[PDB]
């Protein structure tokens, strides 16, 4: 149960820019990353208000989750190297800090770094290359929009790979980024809008397949929506139950559920299409019967049969509906008969 020290300083902006520079240099923070990102997030989102920050929801949720904080008052600080005493790889990291040139500085504040980080979120969990490409294209789109101009230093590959590695390895940053993106979405700032946009784009990253399969296992009808009768079949029952359980264990996570795979929450591991072959197959069958095809669902050769049946089933369901529809309208028995005859004719 890791404890994250949070520091308190008179001048934040300096500490922040000096962190931004350290990340630009590409230092491998390990323990204190959390604290520095905490500072960035404080400065940008919570305006340095430590009370407001510590009272805000995110903190309470995270404390409730497990990673707890503690204040440390350090007013007299200019360089960064002095805020790191915790021995580990500190001399190595220090070498890397001392190695940095103090001369140059890039015009970029927390918000920009945090939005730039946010850019990674959506495709992050897919694959380094995909995520980077996504980031690039989204930057090109944001520059096309004229929503923001990022430093051409950052658009380097290595940098993006470092930040990517950081986002992949660290949780806090993502949790705060997304929390800002969704929960507290006030203010008139651009960075906030970019974050909110990226986070809105990230929703259900890594679950879309499962989600769609579910969409197909569901069924619309005059009496609202219902679970698709096929799925109620006997031989799938256990799979449906385990699925239900999994889906509950996900749902329990509330508003953060769509970001369950990014954050890697508790139950999320138990929801992959491969874990639910029969259901997947059925869903695909239904889809195929309706005409559309379902993405990212390779079906097992034993289940090919199942799917291939499910298609037929769904088609027969669909057909049957028609004659029940006719009934409802207003007509003569013979007219109904002829119409049904016409259904059977058009269908074959």
């Amino acid at each position: 149960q890791r404890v994250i020290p949070v520091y308190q300083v008179n001048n934040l902006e300096e500490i922040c820019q000096l962190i931004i520079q350290a990340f630009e240099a590409g230092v491998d923070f390990q323990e204190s990353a959390d604290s520095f990102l905490l500072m960035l997030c404080l400065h940008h989102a919570y305006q340095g208000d430590y009370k407001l920050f510590l009272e805000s929801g995110a903190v309470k949720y995270l404390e409730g989750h497990g990673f707890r904080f503690e204040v440390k008052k350090r007013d007299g600080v200019k360089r960064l190297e002095e805020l790191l005493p915790a021995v580990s790889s500190g001399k190595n990291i220090k070498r890397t800090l001392a190695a940095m040139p103090e001369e140059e500085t890039t015009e970029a504040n927390a918000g920009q770094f945090l939005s730039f980080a946010s850019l990674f979120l959506p495709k992050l969990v897919v694959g380094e290359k995909a995520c980077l490409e996504k980031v690039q294209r989204q930057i090109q789109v944001h520059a096309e929009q004229g929503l923001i101009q990022y430093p051409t230093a950052w658009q380097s590959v290595g940098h993006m790979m470092v930040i990517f590695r950081l986002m992949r390895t660290n949780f806090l940053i993502k949790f705060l980024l997304i929390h800002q993106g969704m929960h507290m979405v006030a203010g008139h700032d651009a960075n906030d809008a970019v974050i909110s946009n990226s986070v809105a784009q990230a929703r259900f990253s890594g679950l879309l397949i499962v989600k769609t399969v579910l969409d197909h296992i569901l069924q619309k009808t005059e009496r609202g929506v219902r679970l698709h009768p096929l799925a109620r079949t006997a031989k799938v029952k256990n799979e449906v139950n385990s699925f239900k359980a999994a889906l509950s264990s996900l749902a329990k996570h509330g508003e953060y559920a769509p970001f369950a795979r990014l954050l890697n929450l508790s139950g999320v591991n138990n929801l992959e299409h491969g874990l639910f072959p029969q259901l997947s197959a059925i869903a695909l069958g239904v889809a195929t019967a309706h005409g559309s095809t379902l993405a990212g669902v390779n079906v097992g050769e034993q289940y090919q049969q199942l799917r291939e049946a499910a298609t037929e089933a769904e088609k027969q369901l669909q057909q049957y509906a028609e004659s029940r529809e006719l009934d409802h309208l207003g007509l003569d028995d013979q007219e109904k008969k002829i119409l049904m005859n016409f259904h059977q004719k058009k269908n074959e």
Partner: peptide
């Protein structure tokens, strides 16, 4: 006419927990 809920809305509701799964998953 009956068909699969392609809009996602409901899936989203269930996965969010805005609708309890059991409201759809009912064995009796």
């Amino acid at each position: 006419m009956p068909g699969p809920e392609l809009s996602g809305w409901i899936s989203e509701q269930l996965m969010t927990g805005r609708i309890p799964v059991s409201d759809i998953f009912c064995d009796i």
